[PDB]
Amino acid sequence: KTHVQLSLPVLQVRDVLVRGFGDSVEEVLSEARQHLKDGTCGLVEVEKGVLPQLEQPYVFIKRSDAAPHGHVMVELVAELEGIQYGRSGETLGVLVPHVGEIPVAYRKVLLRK
């Protein structure tokens, strides 16, 4: 399937134990996609002071369309030193590994895979 229905645990930035997916744009996009597939991916909502607490390169989910079965259609865009790899809509948040942090909410997305 070109799209997969996922429910992403929304984590508080200060709870996150593993603050990024790796060391290159290509690695973080790779790792993000693997964790999304394996159900080991969390979402941090971006506000003032969040991103400097996480590790670059960042992986964002961005709205790719204006929402089947409650699931917002999203795609992945990486960012490193202010350059983005991909072009998409509004940021829903930054992806991080999930290693058992308690979420505050779930974000239903339809991920272009």
CATH of the domain at 84: 2.30.30
- What is 5-56 written as a DSSP string? EEEEEE--GGG-SS--S-SSHHHHHHHHHHHHHHT-EEEE---TTTGGGSPS
Sign of CA dihedral 93, 78, 85, 31: negative
**What is the number of other CB atoms lying within 10 angstroms of the CB of residue 14?**
9
User: By what method was this entry solved?
Assistant: X-ray
Peptide bond between residue 57 and the one before it cis (omega within 30 degrees of 0): yes
**How many whole angstroms separate alpha carbon 71 and alpha carbon 78?**
21
Judging by DSSP bridges, how do beta strands 91-97 and 83-85 pair with one another?
Answer: unpaired
Q: Do the Cβ atoms of 64 and 73 come closer than 8 Å? A: yes
Dig out the tokens for 19 from the structure: 């603050």
Distance, in Å, from the CA atom of 2 to the CA atom of 28, rounded to the nearest integer, reads 20
The range of the structural domain enclosing residue 74 comes to 3-112
DSSP code of residue 68:
G
Q: What is the DSSP pairing of strand 83-85 with strand 41-44?
A: unpaired
The domain tally of the chain equals: 1
